[model samples]
Target: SFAGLKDADVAAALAACSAADSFKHKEFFAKVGLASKSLDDVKKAFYVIDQDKSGFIEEDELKLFLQNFSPSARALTDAETKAFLADGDKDGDGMIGVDEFAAMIKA
Candidate 1:
């Protein structure tokens, strides 16, 4: 689970994980999508999910972000949510800050 991400970013991130480690920023970007997405796009997406303008994305808020409307598709479960947060929360703050999210998306 991408914790709380749209299919585009989640799918792209998964692909990025298997991408060549030698690829730089642009190279990695090219490997993910239609070869047009940029870091700015990533920032814009972060802004969309950062509801309430709090900078940090809460676990429940993130769950809403990952909402799946289609009946055939299912969203991530609570266990997955906790696991993702546990792995990504670098400071153990019980939540994910902007920096943590940016670091994860970039990585």
Candidate 2:
């Protein structure tokens, strides 16, 4: 599964991926109930999430893999969708890129 990672970096990156967060560093804060991993962990998580190596993910991906209990999948209201799209479309190109995908995953 970890195609590009070194054996040692794989574990560390996975740990970071579990911890890094874009909003409020939710991925990093242990008190928030999310995993308190590191940037490496976050990166690893992104790699896992970005199945197919397409870089960009659609709503189905968000629904199936990213959403959790606290921010339920259903909680992604219309406004939230717009905002997420806006944020993910960092280039304002109406489509997300690998860098934006990585950022969103970290977030």
Candidate 3:
């Protein structure tokens, strides 16, 4: 499976948050190189993070989103996970779809 993301790219994304108070999605996105990828590539990256193959990113999967990027990355706290969903779950189903994920990357 092609996740459209690289190990080194993931590490770079992690480094973007190394000095931040919390996870900053913008900084993370900036380093992940997705900005230069096509929407199909973004969707591939979304499926990679989706984890459960459920076609959506639920709370459980969201908590482990960072780990998908890199094993050394820490799991997001429940509050942090909720904040992440809040930022991407535009439809408010408490989860993120591929479109939502792509929208997040684009914005």
Candidate 4:
């Protein structure tokens, strides 16, 4: 029913896809596509990705992961790290939850 609409219609189609078992594979691909990630990556990544252990990867987590990019090292720049944390810590609670992480991943 949502084959030709845009924006909100696409969102609705995606929402419906979640509940339709027949579209599970499509849903999986859609989710993976958004994050440009793999299921195995998620399994391995989530543990390290969810730094605060709040079960989500916020902008800070992303920044930490990004800044720490090296062929054989993991380190972050204090300034960039702080900026990302400030941007992503939406609720001012000092932590990003699973829902927030998922939203970012989905986006």
Candidate 5:
């Protein structure tokens, strides 16, 4: 039900996704309304989702990413999480940094 998010935020995220028909790995995030958030806001989201206080989002952390935005949100499936991490781990270091995570949200 996206009870945890603002309507406008969800709309913005969905609009971003709609415009990019070829984009992948953004299905769950579109429901997060991250596209409507500022860089600082996204960073805050990143920190909370990073769980271990690490500077990056590891695979396990990423699996739980959506729940941070919406409690009723389903955790990403293993394949979906893998695709997301691979797409956002721009440095190819096997994890997503705050910068990379923001880029992905804004992507």
Candidate 6:
């Protein structure tokens, strides 16, 4: 889409609308309107975590996935770990889907 863009053009875009116009769009970085099952966060790590292959994530699966959650975060207490993913467990069935997890990350 930016096929016509050039070094100077790219350089020009590189400026952060600096000095700056908060309303001005940046040369890169955009936003998503909403979200979904959205498998993918970290992003590949989520896919790997979803090895059980539901649109959801459970503690059993999460115990392993938690490993991907950074060793320090992984070390979080069972109470803490469950509490963390607990919000993502939207259905109240004690598990969360990709979108919820993504939203959790967003928050």
Q: List the residue pairs that clash in candidate 6.
A: none
Query: What is the per-residue lDDT of model 1 for residues 2-70, given as tens digits with 9 covering 90 to 100?
Result: 133356754554444433232233343344431344555556555655766777777876554433222
Candidate 2: which stretches are off by over 4 Å? 1-37, 51-53, 63-75, 101-107
TM-score between model 1 and native:
0.55
lDDT to native, each model: 0.52, 0.45, 0.77, 0.45, 0.68, 0.44
Q: Model 6: residues >4 Å from true position, as ranges? A: 1-43, 69-76
Q: Which stretches of candidate 4 lie over 4 Å from their true place?
A: 1-34, 38-44, 51-71
lDDT of 6: 0.44
TM-score on alpha carbons, each prediction: 0.55, 0.42, 0.83, 0.40, 0.69, 0.46
lDDT of 4 by residue, 1-107 (tens): 11122345445434544331223322433443435554444344455656677576655665455222222323345554455456556677766565444444443
- Residue 46 of model 1 has an lDDT of 57
**TM-score between candidate 5 and the true structure:** 0.69
Question: Model 5 RMSD to the real structure?
Answer: 5.6
Per-residue lDDT tens digits of candidate 2, residues 14-37? 344443232222332232322434
Q: Which ten residues in a row have the lowest lDDT in candidate 5?
A: 14-23
TM-score, ranked from best to worst: 3, 5, 1, 6, 2, 4
User: Backbone clashes per model, in order?
Assistant: 0, 12, 0, 0, 0, 0
lDDT per residue, candidate 5, 7-104, as tens digits? 56655544444332222456545555556667777777778888899898898888776556546555666776777878898888899988898898
What shift in Å separates residue 101 of candidate 2 from its native position after superposition? 4.3
